Amino acid sequence: GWGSFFKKAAHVGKHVGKAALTHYL
């Protein structure tokens, strides 16, 4: 069904992970 959308928002968000280390890494 909709399981093929594995955190579809996070997958795109981590693209700019260079500035995400402030609240991730």
PDB file of all heavy atoms in Angstrom:
ATOM      1  N   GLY A   1       0.824  -1.234   0.000  1.00  0.00           N
ATOM      2  CA  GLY A   1       0.000   0.000   0.000  1.00  0.00           C
ATOM      3  C   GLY A   1       0.841   1.260   0.000  1.00  0.00           C
ATOM      4  O   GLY A   1       1.295   1.711  -1.055  1.00  0.00           O
ATOM      5  N   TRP A   2       1.051   1.832   1.178  1.00  0.00           N
ATOM      6  CA  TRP A   2       1.791   3.085   1.296  1.00  0.00           C
ATOM      7  C   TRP A   2       3.104   2.871   2.044  1.00  0.00           C
ATOM      8  O   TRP A   2       3.758   3.828   2.461  1.00  0.00           O
ATOM      9  CB  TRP A   2       0.943   4.137   2.019  1.00  0.00           C
ATOM     10  CG  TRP A   2      -0.432   4.286   1.446  1.00  0.00           C
ATOM     11  CD1 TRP A   2      -1.592   3.779   1.957  1.00  0.00           C
ATOM     12  CD2 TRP A   2      -0.789   4.971   0.239  1.00  0.00           C
ATOM     13  NE1 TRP A   2      -2.649   4.113   1.149  1.00  0.00           N
ATOM     14  CE2 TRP A   2      -2.184   4.843   0.087  1.00  0.00           C
ATOM     15  CE3 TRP A   2      -0.068   5.684  -0.727  1.00  0.00           C
ATOM     16  CZ2 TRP A   2      -2.870   5.398  -0.988  1.00  0.00           C
ATOM     17  CZ3 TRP A   2      -0.752   6.233  -1.795  1.00  0.00           C
ATOM     18  CH2 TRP A   2      -2.140   6.087  -1.917  1.00  0.00           C
ATOM     19  N   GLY A   3       3.491   1.612   2.200  1.00  0.00           N
ATOM     20  CA  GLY A   3       4.718   1.296   2.906  1.00  0.00           C
ATOM     21  C   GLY A   3       5.951   1.609   2.090  1.00  0.00           C
ATOM     22  O   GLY A   3       7.048   1.711   2.629  1.00  0.00           O
ATOM     23  N   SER A   4       5.768   1.793   0.788  1.00  0.00           N
ATOM     24  CA  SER A   4       6.869   2.136  -0.105  1.00  0.00           C
ATOM     25  C   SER A   4       7.308   3.589   0.083  1.00  0.00           C
ATOM     26  O   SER A   4       8.140   4.100  -0.665  1.00  0.00           O
ATOM     27  CB  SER A   4       6.458   1.892  -1.558  1.00  0.00           C
ATOM     28  OG  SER A   4       6.044   0.550  -1.741  1.00  0.00           O
ATOM     29  N   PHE A   5       6.740   4.250   1.081  1.00  0.00           N
ATOM     30  CA  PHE A   5       7.086   5.626   1.387  1.00  0.00           C
ATOM     31  C   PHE A   5       7.852   5.694   2.702  1.00  0.00           C
ATOM     32  O   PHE A   5       7.495   6.462   3.599  1.00  0.00           O
ATOM     33  CB  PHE A   5       5.824   6.489   1.469  1.00  0.00           C
ATOM     34  CG  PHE A   5       5.108   6.656   0.154  1.00  0.00           C
ATOM     35  CD1 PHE A   5       4.166   5.730  -0.263  1.00  0.00           C
ATOM     36  CD2 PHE A   5       5.378   7.743  -0.660  1.00  0.00           C
ATOM     37  CE1 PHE A   5       3.511   5.881  -1.471  1.00  0.00           C
ATOM     38  CE2 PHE A   5       4.724   7.901  -1.870  1.00  0.00           C
ATOM     39  CZ  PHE A   5       3.789   6.970  -2.274  1.00  0.00           C
ATOM     40  N   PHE A   6       8.903   4.883   2.801  1.00  0.00           N
ATOM     41  CA  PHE A   6       9.720   4.784   4.013  1.00  0.00           C
ATOM     42  C   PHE A   6      10.304   6.141   4.399  1.00  0.00           C
ATOM     43  O   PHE A   6      11.331   6.547   3.850  1.00  0.00           O
ATOM     44  CB  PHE A   6      10.871   3.792   3.802  1.00  0.00           C
ATOM     45  CG  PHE A   6      10.443   2.422   3.354  1.00  0.00           C
ATOM     46  CD1 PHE A   6      10.441   2.091   2.009  1.00  0.00           C
ATOM     47  CD2 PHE A   6      10.055   1.464   4.275  1.00  0.00           C
ATOM     48  CE1 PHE A   6      10.061   0.830   1.590  1.00  0.00           C
ATOM     49  CE2 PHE A   6       9.673   0.202   3.865  1.00  0.00           C
ATOM     50  CZ  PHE A   6       9.677  -0.116   2.520  1.00  0.00           C
ATOM     51  N   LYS A   7       9.656   6.819   5.353  1.00  0.00           N
ATOM     52  CA  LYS A   7      10.060   8.153   5.793  1.00  0.00           C
ATOM     53  C   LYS A   7      10.417   9.048   4.609  1.00  0.00           C
ATOM     54  O   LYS A   7      11.528   9.573   4.523  1.00  0.00           O
ATOM     55  CB  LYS A   7      11.222   8.080   6.787  1.00  0.00           C
ATOM     56  CG  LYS A   7      10.788   7.796   8.221  1.00  0.00           C
ATOM     57  CD  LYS A   7      10.226   6.394   8.393  1.00  0.00           C
ATOM     58  CE  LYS A   7      11.316   5.339   8.266  1.00  0.00           C
ATOM     59  NZ  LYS A   7      10.797   3.969   8.513  1.00  0.00           N
ATOM     60  N   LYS A   8       9.457   9.222   3.705  1.00  0.00           N
ATOM     61  CA  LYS A   8       9.684   9.965   2.462  1.00  0.00           C
ATOM     62  C   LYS A   8      10.173  11.389   2.724  1.00  0.00           C
ATOM     63  O   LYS A   8      10.883  11.974   1.910  1.00  0.00           O
ATOM     64  CB  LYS A   8       8.419   9.983   1.579  1.00  0.00           C
ATOM     65  CG  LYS A   8       7.344  10.976   2.017  1.00  0.00           C
ATOM     66  CD  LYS A   8       6.774  10.629   3.381  1.00  0.00           C
ATOM     67  CE  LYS A   8       5.829   9.438   3.322  1.00  0.00           C
ATOM     68  NZ  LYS A   8       5.212   9.151   4.645  1.00  0.00           N
ATOM     69  N   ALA A   9       9.804  11.917   3.872  1.00  0.00           N
ATOM     70  CA  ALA A   9      10.157  13.280   4.244  1.00  0.00           C
ATOM     71  C   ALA A   9      11.584  13.347   4.780  1.00  0.00           C
ATOM     72  O   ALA A   9      12.315  14.303   4.518  1.00  0.00           O
ATOM     73  CB  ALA A   9       9.175  13.812   5.278  1.00  0.00           C
ATOM     74  N   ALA A  10      11.982  12.314   5.511  1.00  0.00           N
ATOM     75  CA  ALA A  10      13.310  12.263   6.105  1.00  0.00           C
ATOM     76  C   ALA A  10      14.360  11.983   5.039  1.00  0.00           C
ATOM     77  O   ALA A  10      15.474  12.503   5.099  1.00  0.00           O
ATOM     78  CB  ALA A  10      13.363  11.211   7.201  1.00  0.00           C
ATOM     79  N   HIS A  11      13.982  11.174   4.054  1.00  0.00           N
ATOM     80  CA  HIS A  11      14.871  10.821   2.952  1.00  0.00           C
ATOM     81  C   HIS A  11      15.306  12.075   2.196  1.00  0.00           C
ATOM     82  O   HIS A  11      16.447  12.181   1.749  1.00  0.00           O
ATOM     83  CB  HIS A  11      14.164   9.850   2.003  1.00  0.00           C
ATOM     84  CG  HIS A  11      15.076   9.181   1.021  1.00  0.00           C
ATOM     85  ND1 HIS A  11      15.361   7.837   1.068  1.00  0.00           N
ATOM     86  CD2 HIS A  11      15.755   9.670  -0.043  1.00  0.00           C
ATOM     87  CE1 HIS A  11      16.177   7.526   0.080  1.00  0.00           C
ATOM     88  NE2 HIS A  11      16.432   8.621  -0.610  1.00  0.00           N
ATOM     89  N   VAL A  12      14.388  13.021   2.059  1.00  0.00           N
ATOM     90  CA  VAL A  12      14.671  14.266   1.362  1.00  0.00           C
ATOM     91  C   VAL A  12      15.371  15.252   2.296  1.00  0.00           C
ATOM     92  O   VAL A  12      16.226  16.029   1.868  1.00  0.00           O
ATOM     93  CB  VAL A  12      13.379  14.905   0.805  1.00  0.00           C
ATOM     94  CG1 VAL A  12      13.694  16.141  -0.022  1.00  0.00           C
ATOM     95  CG2 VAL A  12      12.594  13.895  -0.022  1.00  0.00           C
ATOM     96  N   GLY A  13      15.013  15.201   3.573  1.00  0.00           N
ATOM     97  CA  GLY A  13      15.586  16.111   4.547  1.00  0.00           C
ATOM     98  C   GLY A  13      17.070  15.887   4.761  1.00  0.00           C
ATOM     99  O   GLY A  13      17.841  16.844   4.836  1.00  0.00           O
ATOM    100  N   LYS A  14      17.480  14.623   4.835  1.00  0.00           N
ATOM    101  CA  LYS A  14      18.875  14.278   5.092  1.00  0.00           C
ATOM    102  C   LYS A  14      19.795  14.669   3.932  1.00  0.00           C
ATOM    103  O   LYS A  14      21.018  14.589   4.054  1.00  0.00           O
ATOM    104  CB  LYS A  14      18.992  12.778   5.403  1.00  0.00           C
ATOM    105  CG  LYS A  14      18.620  11.841   4.249  1.00  0.00           C
ATOM    106  CD  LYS A  14      19.751  11.660   3.240  1.00  0.00           C
ATOM    107  CE  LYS A  14      21.004  11.101   3.895  1.00  0.00           C
ATOM    108  NZ  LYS A  14      22.116  10.936   2.922  1.00  0.00           N
ATOM    109  N   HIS A  15      19.208  15.083   2.812  1.00  0.00           N
ATOM    110  CA  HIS A  15      19.983  15.488   1.642  1.00  0.00           C
ATOM    111  C   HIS A  15      20.897  16.653   2.002  1.00  0.00           C
ATOM    112  O   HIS A  15      22.040  16.735   1.548  1.00  0.00           O
ATOM    113  CB  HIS A  15      19.051  15.907   0.508  1.00  0.00           C
ATOM    114  CG  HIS A  15      19.670  15.849  -0.856  1.00  0.00           C
ATOM    115  ND1 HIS A  15      19.881  16.962  -1.635  1.00  0.00           N
ATOM    116  CD2 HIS A  15      20.088  14.794  -1.595  1.00  0.00           C
ATOM    117  CE1 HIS A  15      20.398  16.601  -2.792  1.00  0.00           C
ATOM    118  NE2 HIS A  15      20.534  15.288  -2.798  1.00  0.00           N
ATOM    119  N   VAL A  16      20.383  17.548   2.835  1.00  0.00           N
ATOM    120  CA  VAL A  16      21.156  18.675   3.318  1.00  0.00           C
ATOM    121  C   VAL A  16      21.666  18.413   4.728  1.00  0.00           C
ATOM    122  O   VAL A  16      21.631  19.284   5.601  1.00  0.00           O
ATOM    123  CB  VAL A  16      20.352  19.974   3.320  1.00  0.00           C
ATOM    124  CG1 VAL A  16      20.243  20.547   1.915  1.00  0.00           C
ATOM    125  CG2 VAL A  16      18.969  19.768   3.925  1.00  0.00           C
ATOM    126  N   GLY A  17      22.152  17.207   4.924  1.00  0.00           N
ATOM    127  CA  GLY A  17      22.627  16.764   6.224  1.00  0.00           C
ATOM    128  C   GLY A  17      23.832  17.537   6.715  1.00  0.00           C
ATOM    129  O   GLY A  17      24.197  17.445   7.889  1.00  0.00           O
ATOM    130  N   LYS A  18      24.435  18.312   5.826  1.00  0.00           N
ATOM    131  CA  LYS A  18      25.602  19.111   6.171  1.00  0.00           C
ATOM    132  C   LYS A  18      25.263  20.107   7.274  1.00  0.00           C
ATOM    133  O   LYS A  18      26.103  20.438   8.105  1.00  0.00           O
ATOM    134  CB  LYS A  18      26.126  19.867   4.946  1.00  0.00           C
ATOM    135  CG  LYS A  18      26.525  18.976   3.777  1.00  0.00           C
ATOM    136  CD  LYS A  18      25.334  18.620   2.894  1.00  0.00           C
ATOM    137  CE  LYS A  18      25.760  17.796   1.689  1.00  0.00           C
ATOM    138  NZ  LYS A  18      24.648  17.588   0.723  1.00  0.00           N
ATOM    139  N   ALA A  19      24.023  20.576   7.276  1.00  0.00           N
ATOM    140  CA  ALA A  19      23.566  21.521   8.281  1.00  0.00           C
ATOM    141  C   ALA A  19      22.536  20.873   9.197  1.00  0.00           C
ATOM    142  O   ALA A  19      21.772  21.557   9.877  1.00  0.00           O
ATOM    143  CB  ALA A  19      22.983  22.757   7.617  1.00  0.00           C
ATOM    144  N   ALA A  20      22.517  19.547   9.214  1.00  0.00           N
ATOM    145  CA  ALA A  20      21.563  18.811  10.033  1.00  0.00           C
ATOM    146  C   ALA A  20      22.249  18.204  11.242  1.00  0.00           C
ATOM    147  O   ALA A  20      21.592  17.734  12.166  1.00  0.00           O
ATOM    148  CB  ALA A  20      20.883  17.723   9.224  1.00  0.00           C
ATOM    149  N   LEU A  21      23.579  18.244  11.237  1.00  0.00           N
ATOM    150  CA  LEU A  21      24.380  17.670  12.318  1.00  0.00           C
ATOM    151  C   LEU A  21      24.097  18.365  13.647  1.00  0.00           C
ATOM    152  O   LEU A  21      24.496  17.888  14.706  1.00  0.00           O
ATOM    153  CB  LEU A  21      25.874  17.737  11.965  1.00  0.00           C
ATOM    154  CG  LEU A  21      26.400  19.099  11.491  1.00  0.00           C
ATOM    155  CD1 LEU A  21      26.614  20.048  12.662  1.00  0.00           C
ATOM    156  CD2 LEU A  21      27.697  18.921  10.718  1.00  0.00           C
ATOM    157  N   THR A  22      23.388  19.480  13.579  1.00  0.00           N
ATOM    158  CA  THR A  22      23.046  20.250  14.765  1.00  0.00           C
ATOM    159  C   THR A  22      21.917  19.571  15.543  1.00  0.00           C
ATOM    160  O   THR A  22      21.733  19.810  16.735  1.00  0.00           O
ATOM    161  CB  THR A  22      22.606  21.670  14.375  1.00  0.00           C
ATOM    162  OG1 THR A  22      23.304  22.081  13.190  1.00  0.00           O
ATOM    163  CG2 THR A  22      22.887  22.656  15.500  1.00  0.00           C
ATOM    164  N   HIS A  23      21.170  18.709  14.860  1.00  0.00           N
ATOM    165  CA  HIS A  23      20.035  18.026  15.472  1.00  0.00           C
ATOM    166  C   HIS A  23      19.864  16.634  14.879  1.00  0.00           C
ATOM    167  O   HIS A  23      18.766  16.236  14.496  1.00  0.00           O
ATOM    168  CB  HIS A  23      18.745  18.850  15.306  1.00  0.00           C
ATOM    169  CG  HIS A  23      18.458  19.290  13.899  1.00  0.00           C
ATOM    170  ND1 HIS A  23      18.636  20.586  13.467  1.00  0.00           N
ATOM    171  CD2 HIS A  23      17.990  18.601  12.829  1.00  0.00           C
ATOM    172  CE1 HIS A  23      18.290  20.675  12.194  1.00  0.00           C
ATOM    173  NE2 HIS A  23      17.897  19.484  11.785  1.00  0.00           N
ATOM    174  N   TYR A  24      20.963  15.900  14.805  1.00  0.00           N
ATOM    175  CA  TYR A  24      20.952  14.578  14.196  1.00  0.00           C
ATOM    176  C   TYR A  24      22.164  13.766  14.633  1.00  0.00           C
ATOM    177  O   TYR A  24      22.029  12.714  15.258  1.00  0.00           O
ATOM    178  CB  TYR A  24      20.927  14.710  12.668  1.00  0.00           C
ATOM    179  CG  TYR A  24      21.041  13.401  11.916  1.00  0.00           C
ATOM    180  CD1 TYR A  24      19.938  12.573  11.747  1.00  0.00           C
ATOM    181  CD2 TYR A  24      22.252  13.003  11.359  1.00  0.00           C
ATOM    182  CE1 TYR A  24      20.041  11.384  11.050  1.00  0.00           C
ATOM    183  CE2 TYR A  24      22.359  11.818  10.659  1.00  0.00           C
ATOM    184  CZ  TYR A  24      21.254  11.013  10.506  1.00  0.00           C
ATOM    185  OH  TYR A  24      21.362   9.834   9.808  1.00  0.00           O
ATOM    186  N   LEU A  25      23.342  14.267  14.300  1.00  0.00           N
ATOM    187  CA  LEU A  25      24.576  13.561  14.546  1.00  0.00           C
ATOM    188  C   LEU A  25      25.120  13.890  15.937  1.00  0.00           C
ATOM    189  O   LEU A  25      25.967  14.802  16.050  1.00  0.00           O
ATOM    190  CB  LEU A  25      25.578  13.953  13.463  1.00  0.00           C
ATOM    191  CG  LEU A  25      26.862  13.152  13.445  1.00  0.00           C
ATOM    192  CD1 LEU A  25      26.566  11.699  13.124  1.00  0.00           C
ATOM    193  CD2 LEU A  25      27.820  13.751  12.439  1.00  0.00           C
TER     194      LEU A  25
END
